[PDB]
């Protein structure tokens with residue numbers, strides 16, 4: 676079955692702001708998502724140091740970027756610690772961290788949207804370039820789940836039937852019509868070079884044939 680949840684009020688407000696505010700520097704979404712993957716990878720590594728068996732679900736720690744022009748999706752995949760169903764629901768929409776209103780209060784006055792990451796809500800910058808975001812995740816302690824939202828104040832969670840991931844999180848950006856530049860090899864390379872040069876895990880940019 677599919678479960679539908681309301682975003683907490685302030686998160687809905689943030690998402691609307693991200694979608695409606697004129698802001699040309701959209702590329703920062705990729706930095707924020709790679710940062711999130713890096714943090715998740717840090718966590719499973721940290722845990723594996725005391726209990727190595729937590730890598731039984733996959734020893735390699737990496738980030739893959741996978742453009743698909745036919746589906747018009749950009750997918751960020753990591754083999755980080757992943758999220759349980761509860762982690763998913765609690766951290767991707769139903770609970771507003773302090774940084775949510777702090778950020779929007781920051782946008783009032785001087786701050787610009789590129790600072791979003793500093794408030795711990797950088798995930799939502801995905802809606803700078805995506806009309807719908809799907810998050811597939813698998814944590815050692817739980818089943819594989821799919822989160823999805825086109826904003827508008829709700830998201831869904833369901834058990835995922837797709838290819839099993841072993842462990843980690845996959846963010847699938849269904850790109851807006853006018854944002855297909857982020858499917859281009861040279862454009863993604865440029866952004867990763869500029870914003871994510873010192874990530875401590877291998878980042879592989881997959882290519883497509885003509």
Ligand SMILES: Cc1ccccc1[C@H]1CCCN1C(=O)c1cc(Cl)c(O)cc1O
Nearest residue numbers: 708711712714715755757758766798844
């Ligand atoms: C950083 C972060 C913020 C909010 C919730 C969860 C996370 C990370 C740490 C614990 C598990 N995790 C994730 O599974 C994860 C999530 C998102 Cl949103 C992503 O883009 C990539 C990921 O690997």
